Amino acid sequence: IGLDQIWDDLRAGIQQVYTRQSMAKSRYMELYTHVYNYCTSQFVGLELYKRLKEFLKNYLTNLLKDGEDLMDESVLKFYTQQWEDYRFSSKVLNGICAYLNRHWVRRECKGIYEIYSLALVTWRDCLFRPLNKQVTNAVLKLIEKERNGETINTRLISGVVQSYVELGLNEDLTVYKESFESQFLADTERFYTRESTEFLQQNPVTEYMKKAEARLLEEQRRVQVYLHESTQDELARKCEQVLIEKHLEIFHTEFQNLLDADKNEDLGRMYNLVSRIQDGLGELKKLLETHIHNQGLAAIEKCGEAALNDPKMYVQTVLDVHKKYNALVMSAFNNDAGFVAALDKACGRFINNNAVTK
Amino acid sequence: KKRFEVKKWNAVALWAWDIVVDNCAICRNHIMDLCIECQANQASATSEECTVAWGVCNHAFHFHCISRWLKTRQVCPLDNREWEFQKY
């Protein structure tokens, strides 16, 4: 053939293509061909492959310099941006080079293997140590304007997630998970610990829960909007612990308050917030049960001394209380068997040992 | 003179079979504490519980004439078919 007249002709196109001066289809084929012609003369693939590899290696290794030291706003723009711009030309490199993928590589049954994969693989001399940490902290900062934050970095964050995933490895959901979901989650776990408690100092429990219930939905939404989905259950797991159980003690305490007042609406989103934590209800259930037990109690007393001498008023007094709380069981505690139980137990813990009897 | 006449009267009456209520159809002598066993051997801790009790198939008998006189295999003799306890 002539490579000293052929390769360069193609290095240029591989270059041109990695800059999108938008080449006319007059070139795609012209290029593709070069390859096709090369790998036809069962090796005839190696060299070309060895050469391409460097082309990527260099270009990345000599464009990291444009990125290293980059800011956490400025850096994302840089990575995300360079990413799109890349995986794109990366792919279009495939076809111009596809002929090489299907035979020549096919014979490998080591390192040397596919191409689009390579591009990605090689970009992993632009993630592992370079921007990685860096790029993720960037993301972390932004996501942290989880405070009154600004709206578009979405592209900035999701952009990272993109490459962290498909970078997924490939060699021979980990990276994105090792590199990102690990820290992200971590940082998230602290953000809400500082917030939750500080909050519960100057505000109602039952004002907290609204802030509690809010963030869970909130972070649910963010996973959908721009983080990879695999990162949902867990985040829910983490934030839940943090915003509903750790505080599971103030709740246990406040609970008894509502029950005394009749703040159902509150009482209710509690049976909803706790519910989200493993067997964390045990107390509310035993707690509630103690309540209506005492309630049906004071209730029947407020009537009998010489008032038990009234058949109906009594059976009445009872049933009423029963109604209020059965009423609250369905509504407030979602007819959870656990509370109905507390309801029953407590009723059977008063209908039979009172001032009408003793 | 004076007078008040029964403008209107009403009534009720518990029933039974002919006349046997005076005995367990086993212990015929009177309506005291006999029940055979409790009258053949005095001095015990069972003669304190031998009042009057009824059934359902109409036969009339004491209170102790249930345990020491019955158990065998199925329903009441002569009048088998079915049986109900009740009447306490």
């Binding site: 790998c39 036809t40 003369s41 069962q42 005839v44 035979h103 020549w104 014979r107 | -």
Partner: protein, 41 residues
Amino acid sequence: WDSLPDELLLGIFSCLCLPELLKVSGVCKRWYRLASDESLW
């Protein structure tokens, strides 16, 4: 021949029953090695 590559030509030799490869085996120098496993057997 000349025009026809190895990867391709080695595809033709793929629809031949092993024993047959003994016939092709001697057609000409090139055809010989090709008959030796590269994908076949």
